[PDB]
DNA sequence: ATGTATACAT
DNA sequence: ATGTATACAT
């Protein structure tokens, strides 16, 4: 936002994700106010917003501490997204989707197919990730329920939890621009099952889709330990 | 808490749940501060805590509005708890549970069996609900993951979402003190599947268990429209 | 209105 | 330390 509190959130978030403000660090109002050249008031607001964002934990006595995240927490958070995305898909199958909503998601699927040429590596890496995030948002709202959309989007809220999190500009190597051809099939399958009222298949595929990220992350560890810093908010991991 | 902000949260929550502060009502700092005889400062804190609690929504321009909840939102929220509790059970099966943790949950299951005599209506309604809430907390932490415990407990956070929500003192009628005999079997089944590393069964039963509440609520609508007010936070429903 | 700084109490 | 009231700007 155009406010000190708004800016404070953006700055503090950046510092937390960069590792600058490490996990387990207690953030004091007085000292954070000093760091941001603002008073305690917009700081309290920022700390309260970053708390609902899940980057900070409120302490028992009062006060805030930066949340600790291990590779364990990356694994589980991806699993929860999968479970949630699966629930979003299953409910769309069980309950039905309006023609309008189905047209929208089918259109995004078509646009995502346009990102593929003919070769194993000929793929618009930047154009895909932007559309992929559109798909996941549509799927979250697809069953019609707001409560579901809200909760599904929250499970895909953390930086490593995000759908297009394991799609940065630098991780453009052959081991990830080949996996995407298959992820597009999963996207097609999700919709195709929803249309077919195949709840089991819908949930199953939507879960297996999130497992693509866990798969990609496990390759970044074993094949590029320096590209670890590249993933949006993977630098903050204490492992 | 022993603070104005702490008290403010407790009061505001009470007013929201009672319907006194209806859903869709914008809460202004100045006017809430007047209502609570406190200044804007502990109010801002209360509004920020009730926001992370999910009883208030932040508005685009700034400000807070009381969240609207329909019977649709009760249905979906129960479903999400089920999905989450299922995930907590499935992961406990897939990953394994320490002897200590398994002893604890098995002990709670035993204590819950003590709440049953021999007749269809001979059941400690107050003693069950308190132990039932212990079970659900144990199950949430059973797979060992903190991230899972945290997210499972959140899906069981809303007043109607809670495990022992459809177990108040007045809803002591024969249509709910008979259902509990079967819910104890579901509790046994959950643990028995976890021990047996039967992931499918664990998730399946844990989901079907939450459906007991949706079943109970659907009977309260069709058979006791005045006992609607009795459920902890069901008064705030705009249907 | 909410944003903000700040003085005083703990 | 965080809690709190409050004056001033929007
Ligand atoms: Zn995707
Ligand atoms: Zn239960």
UniProtKB/TrEMBL annotation, chains A, B:
CDD domains in the record, alphabetically?
Answer: WHTH_GntR (cd07377)
Molecular function GO labels: DNA binding; DNA-binding transcription factor activity; metal ion binding
Which InterPro entries does the UniProt record give? GntR_C, TF_FadR/GntR_C, Tscrpt_reg_HTH_GntR, WH-like_DNA-bd_sf, WH_DNA-bd_sf
Q: List residues binding Zn(2+).
A: 132, 136, 187, 209
Which keywords describe this protein according to UniProt?
A: DNA-binding, Metal-binding, Transcription, Transcription regulation, Zinc
Q: Which domain of life is it from?
A: Bacteria
SMART domains xrefs = FCD, HTH_GNTR
**What Pfam families does the record tag this protein with?**
FCD (PF07729), GntR (PF00392)
Q: Which Gene3D superfamilies match?
A: GntR ligand-binding domain-like (1.20.120.530), Winged helix-like DNA-binding domain superfamily/Winged helix DNA-binding domain (1.10.10.10)
Domain HTH gntR-type per the UniProt entry, residue ranges: 2-69
Q: What is this protein called?
A: Transcriptional regulator, GntR family
